[PDB]
């Protein structure tokens, strides 16, 4: 009827199966084991072999390599590793069932119900919607029934990421500053009714004296929308929140300080800041976590025009500081100077802001880890441990006065959007944001390296990657528990 | 530190692969007599099957010199050492994969790897610290010529691995594939290699901290605490299979000098060096951001900065005590 | 023991098998047919499915899609197409047996013994030699015995191409102007004893007044070697030959007019001119074709140095004409001005020269067809028909006075290496070579677009492609018959 993804590990006496696999073997009377011998070598991690007709009801039994049984927290790679194995191995498996055009598939728990699910789902995602030529929409349910609460945690966690991936991925002619808000609000409210949304317009942002976010929007004729998310998880409402901020340039052309045509079509994902953290709240509300969280994301676009932000321009952020706007492409810095200032109104506990800010971050670490600066070692620890679990790494980066210094000397004004020199890119830019933050637990997460995937993460197909959404989710789970 | 600053700073017409060795040896021996130096020539490096360091030198007509420092601090001689390795391109013009004229006169300090760690031993011997340390630094130059290293070239490092040489400016990676391989001969405890490797490091952190990758959290801790004291910061950077993967797929050969993509620069390059290291306590220190100072560090005047020499010294003090 | 590549086509009543396949089905008693149903959809062209243990002696039976049974000469695509199908389909198949680490494989004739062979072999080639980490060396024999003369024509034709692919592919530190000659001579002599080789040195080239080829070599310290191939196929020796000329820069760095570091490591295949045509003669001598052919290829390197060719330089080609050398990267033009002049000495019938000359050719047609200019419609026809058969297309390109005109006005000299303007790149360059040719049947073949493959040609793996060697071979077969 449908396919099945089985798992196996490496040697002992004969490479052991995952118990779903062992079970299914006994069932076809050893002949899965038997054909595995006959087929070729053994399956190291992530490798895949497909055995037809072993079962009546399962034409295609794909067996995938799970690596070491006891594979675990790796001191170097900074993650759990079995999980990492399982994720690529059922991803590998599920993409084989999807190429066999099998619309539904059943999947080995593989000892970590959650991981096989985040594999099956992250693994299968595309963003098919605008091609009439699409792959089969395969349905992936668990195999078994003993462990359902964590496989659904898989499908949950993986989906909230897939959310961001479709929110980033979609062309910025479709996924606008409004349509992004429309979907989010819709996603947050279908997540829980303990939620309020505020797709605040130009008038309110004007009213908020958000000079800097506004200076940015004015290039396009597409409207600014400052978005406000709320989830009231806490039993006592009055618990002060955790506030997520996120940059939402739906399209970045650089503005007057205009980009090269070389791969500028990826700037449709310069709203990844906004998308990631939004998907995290949509997800923390599906988990319905005992915490009040607040999504804040200035959605607008960077374009050149007769009224676009010019080089040399001093503008006023909400907080009273002026900014020389020396480079119109350093604009997340300005959109974020204001929603950061607004974050403090909420009396937060943690202000995690996130953004696709600098290509320099990409030059830095580049899709390994999502670089995170933070005046909180406590906070750093927290994001990092969560990243160990989820596998979407995070690497601390420096928030040193050294860097502030460069941004702070300024011809016209109080702060400059680009620092004195070429060097230290993400640090300069994070140094600019701290000028707009007085809280003891702030975290900049520059996501410009994890904006995309090709092959680097196995279980993600090519296209917007939606990172580090699950590490953000997992952090708020653990902070709630 | 000022030593390294004059060793980096001086024009690469004066401060050659030999004159660097001459001064170092002179500085190490005036530091203590418990010292031996070996300004080994092309013949010995040829003999060492250091194909990769050699492939690099052959552009210039200026001679390669693989340098060997020794300081026998330990009461029992037979304590296995701490080994410092350091890249010593006295001048880097990129070679056939040639640089822009924009500020190429700073490549006279692409021997900062060699200079920093050398100054550290000169210093650990003045302190006369109860440890045997070994300086190792391939000194040579990158130039274009009728016999310069070409793009596409597979060469053989000492250890048997081949390297596609896709970009002649990624050459510290090759000079270092070999002195890293030679480091293991010494049965070290710590192999700290140091180099002005990638401009990407400069793009990364850029003169705040000297980026350090290491398969040793222990070792990381050690360099970092020392940096707390001295103020010459150090920032850990990732040595993830992710990055190895890019360097490892290779058309012609076993390893490629530049990885698959533009992104993750210092990590790709550090991933290349680990292919030439099997020891449990290795540390890459990319010094390309701290190569210079203007005003960033107050107490250094404008010019070659000589970083992170005191953090290296302070580490070997504390490791000795 | 070993694997097997079977073929099947599309529908009629039930998709027909190739008779090897039909035969092997009856043999396992229909159960190959049977499992094909059970497995998934049908296999359109180039697609592949792998069935283990159907046979005792054939653990892995891969079945591959052959497209239409009656698939043939395509008016648009300008080729035979069944052949094109079969080539990618067994290539597809053989790369599955090689990933199953099966060292030997037996292969379906697929109705075109030759094509399945040029697929199995072109398909399997890599250039493993410098990695210690290599894939299994799988051995591919025919399945059956009825049609052996044409499958060996496959393996022949595909191998002579694979020759060029290893001659191009190898680093120019190993594959020098001498080591290229050493291998060729070795390959030509093991092809037939009716052969002479002349690895003529600088002294002889100096003696030949080959000022222009020499001006080029002088940058490197690596020696020039003008190579002379001979194959005396003709019953009467005195039949005047067909002469192939080919540019052999083993490495092109541009010289003083120096290249960008962006992918300059591909210039190790700027000796593809020399390699292609050399492999063709090595091959025409294995076929032992009733024609005398003469290989001529100036092997040397382009480097910058204290004695490198400078911009502005007038040098003297053999024939008396001077050349302003305005761009040291237009150097195939000069290496070729002289071996073209030498070609006429031989009293040829056809002078086919071939070279990786212009990136403009790549901009032009770019790996579809190998652009060919020729003052002979007869000759054009000939190369083109051969290309229909082999599938390695060729596209005529213009040799108009228009273009000569630009190259011909020259400040200092008689000819300039780059023409007056940016436009018309390959035509300007081919216009330069005709100034060095007075014969009625000359053909420039610019191979800069087919220098590489990624995925464009199915049955070639990523790396130097070795094109258009079989079309050259096939032309000399047909010219001999
Ligand atoms: Mg921008
Ligand atoms: Mg360099
Ligand atoms: Mg050229
Ligand atoms: Zn932006
Ligand atoms: Zn260098
Ligand atoms: Zn050329």
Curated annotation (Swiss-Prot), chains A, C:
InterPro entries named among the record's database cross-references: Leucine_aapep/pepB, Macro_dom-like, Peptidase_M17_C, Peptidase_M17_leu_NH2_pept, Peptidase_M17_N
Binding site for Zn(2+) 2: 247, 252, 270, 331
A single GO cellular-component term on record: mitochondrion
GO molecular function: carboxypeptidase activity; dipeptidase activity; disordered domain specific binding; manganese ion binding; metalloaminopeptidase activity; peptidase activity
Cofactor(s) this protein cannot do without: Zn(2+); Mn(2+)
Positions where N6-succinyllysine occurs in the chain: 26, 68, 420, 441, 454
Binding site for Mg(2+): 252, 329, 331
Ligand binding (Zn(2+) 3): 167-168, 170, 268
Function summary: Cytosolic metallopeptidase that catalyzes the removal of unsubstituted N-terminal hydrophobic amino acids from various peptides. The presence of Zn(2+) ions is essential for the peptidase activity, and the association with other cofactors can modulate the substrate spectificity of the enzyme. For instance, in the presence of Mn(2+), it displays a specific Cys-Gly hydrolyzing activity of Cys-Gly-S-conjugates. Involved in the metabolism of glutathione and in the degradation of glutathione S-conjugates, which may play a role in the control of the cell redox status.
Residues annotated for substrate binding in this entry: 247, 252, 257, 259, 270, 329
Oligomeric and partner information: Homohexamer.
Keywords, comma-separated and alphabetical: Acetylation, Aminopeptidase, Cobalt, Cytoplasm, Dipeptidase, Hydrolase, Magnesium, Manganese, Metal-binding, Phosphoprotein, Protease, Zinc
Modified residues (Phosphoserine): 10, 19, 145, 159, 203
Modified positions (N6-acetyllysine) in chain numbering: 420, 454
EC number: 3.4.11.1, 3.4.13.23, 3.4.11.5
Chain sites annotated for binding Zn(2+) 1: 252, 329, 331
GO biological process: proteolysis
Active-site residue list: 259, 333
Keyword Phosphoprotein on entry: yes
Gene name per UniProt: LAP3
Protein name per its UniProtKB record: Cytosol aminopeptidase
Free-text cofactor note: Binds two metal ions per subunit. Two metal binding sites with different affinities are located in the enzyme active site and can be occupied in vitro by different metals: site 1 is occupied by Zn(2+), Mn(2+), Mg(2+) or Co(2+), while the tight binding site 2 can be occupied by only Zn(2+) or Co(2+). One Zn(2+) ion is tightly bound to site 2 and essential for enzyme activity in vivo, while site 1 can be occupied by different metals to give different enzymatic activities. Mn(2+) is required for Cys-Gly hydrolysis activity.
Means of activity regulation: Zofenoprilat inhibits Cys-Gly hydrolysis activity.
Subcellular location as annotated: Cytoplasm
Membership in a protein family: Belongs to the peptidase M17 family.
Catalytic activity: Release of an N-terminal amino acid, Xaa-|-Yaa-, in which Xaa is preferably Leu, but may be other amino acids including Pro although not Arg or Lys, and Yaa may be Pro. Amino acid amides and methyl esters are also readily hydrolyzed, but rates on arylamides are exceedingly low; an S-substituted L-cysteinylglycine + H2O = an S-substituted L-cysteine + glycine; L-cysteinylglycine + H2O = L-cysteine + glycine; S-benzyl-L-cysteinylglycine + H2O = S-benzyl-L-cysteine + glycine
